[PDB]
Design brief:
Number of strands of chain A: 0
Oligomer: heterotetramer
Helix content of chain A: 55-70%
Domain NR LBD (chains B, C): 2-225
Largest sheet of chain B: 2 strands, antiparallel
Strand order of the largest sheet of chain B: 1-2
Order of helices and strands of chain B: HHHEEHHHHH
Order of helices and strands of chain A: H
Structural class of chain B: mainly alpha
Number of strands of chain B: 2
Number of helices of chain B: 8
Helix content of chain B: 55-70%
CATH superfamily of chain B: Retinoid X Receptor
CATH architecture of chain B: Orthogonal Bundle
Function (chains B, C): Nuclear hormone receptor. Binds estrogens with an affinity similar to that of ESR1/ER-alpha, and activates expression of reporter genes containing estrogen response elements (ERE) in an estrogen-dependent manner.
Organism (chains B, C): Homo sapiens (Human)
Family (chains B, C): Belongs to the nuclear hormone receptor family. NR3 subfamily.
CATH class of chain B: Mainly Alpha
Subcellular location (chains B, C): Nucleus
Radius of gyration of chain B: 18 Å
Shape of chain A: elongated
Bound molecules: genistein
Structural class of chain A: mainly alpha
Chain lengths: 10, 225, 225, 10
């Protein structure tokens, strides 16, 4: 789920 | 948003230059592969931030954003690899501290096949004298055209980028006939990037299954997906 | 050789539709793979004849001819399939008497996925309202662009067909901007066709190893090639 | 072989 957390954070 | 300004935002979405923090030295099979995998993992982080800086990308449903990146990541990495190697014929500039040669890819079985593919396509873009702005649009298109309410959003975005590439070519100042021929030739080279991509990932997957390379978290996830 | 002459030449060169009979009983994993393989075998023979008609193709070195055909045969077959199904949403016209419904792909382990993308891409072409003459040029471009001074002659042959495609689109009468836009939209689909090609061949190699159905002669050679 | 013959023999 690495991809999703980076897609939802800045 | 005019084509010119969309191209600008793509220039601003450009990821920073990445280095693997490795001191100059010959490459063995283990050092090369761990270097390529470590580098890919770092770039993947920057690729995600890049995509989000593409106007409208974060408007897409979370499902689309994920499916687009999970499918095109390797192609985008190799497209970046080819633009970095454009001015260094015979060499693959994965990174400042990771410059490889065709013969150096022989210490790893099956990778030489791929270095040759990456070098030929790079050589092709070189002949056509690929421009930075053209590179920006193409890379963006690779991400938006990997789809194998949100759907309309995508097509509209892909269309905008396509419209930006056509604009770039138009500014070159060449014949209209030559603008169409250049557009077609740049787009056809994508199939070549995609092919080197499938081969590159088939090879990585094999390396992973053999636990020969430390497949970091982000890289592994993208791979398995 | 003007664009029109090249186009008409490709038109005459179109292979005649192969007639394969649909099995009497409802499809089983074996009978379907048998039908698809037999059909492919027969079409591959006509594809070879079709290729020798593409202007300048027989002038390339025998080895370039082989590499080109080995590298794109499935993509060419599927491009043909999609065209034949252009006017039949939710239906795949492999042959006149072999109209496979998307659902019937459930008898084959893992083939439904391919049927889905084949139908999707087909719909994309339907949406763009692909024309016969455009289709002819694109199919030839697939062969000439699969390069995955004969190498110098290949590039020239590819520009001639591309040149013919630009001519076809121009005859549609739409604005210069839209001509560029339609050209890009058509070529951006070659990726999708290619993807289905890769998944198709990977699925065939798989079925062969599982002894699901026999694969020899022309087909086998093209598969391993 | 079979591909080569269709290309050169046919
Ligand atoms: O090309 C790559 C890359 C790679 C790294 C950085 C880039 O910018 C592009 C490709 C990473 O891991 C591999 C792993 C492999 O087994 C084979 C490969 O060809 C590669
Ligand atoms: O689509 C095909 C075709 C095929 C047959 C005739 C055509 O005109 C196009 C594709 C042949 O073998 C397969 C074999 C497979 O395992 C999976 C497939 O999707 C196919």
């Amino acid at each position: 789920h690495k991809l999703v957390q980076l897609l939802t954070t800045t | 948003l005019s084509p010119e300004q969309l191209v600008l935002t793509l220039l601003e979405a450009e990821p920073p230059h990445v280095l693997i923090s490795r001191p100059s030295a010959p490459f063995t099979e283990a050092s090369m592969m761990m270097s390529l995998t470590k580098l890919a993992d770092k770039e993947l982080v920057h690729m995600i931030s890049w995509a989000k800086k593409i106007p409208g990308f974060v408007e897409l449903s979370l499902f689309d954003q994920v499916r687009l990146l999970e499918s095109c990541w390797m192609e985008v990495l190799m497209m970046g690899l080819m633009w970095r190697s454009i001015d260094h014929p015979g060499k693959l500039i994965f990174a400042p501290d990771l410059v490889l040669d065709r013969d150096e890819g022989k210490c790893v079985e099956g990778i030489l096949e791929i270095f040759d593919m990456l070098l030929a396509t790079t050589s092709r873009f070189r002949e056509l004298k690929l421009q930075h702005k053209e590179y920006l649009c193409v890379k963006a298109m690779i991400l938006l055209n990997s789809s194998m309410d949100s759907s309309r959003k995508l097509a509209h975005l892909l269309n905008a980028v396509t419209d930006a590439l056509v604009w770039v070519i138009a500014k070159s100042g060449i014949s209209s006939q030559q603008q169409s021929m250049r557009l077609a030739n740049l787009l056809m080279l994508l199939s070549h990037v995609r092919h080197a991509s499938n081969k590159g990932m088939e090879h990585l997957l094999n390396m992973k299954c053999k636990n020969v390379v430390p497949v970091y978290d982000l890289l592994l996830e993208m791979l398995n997906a």
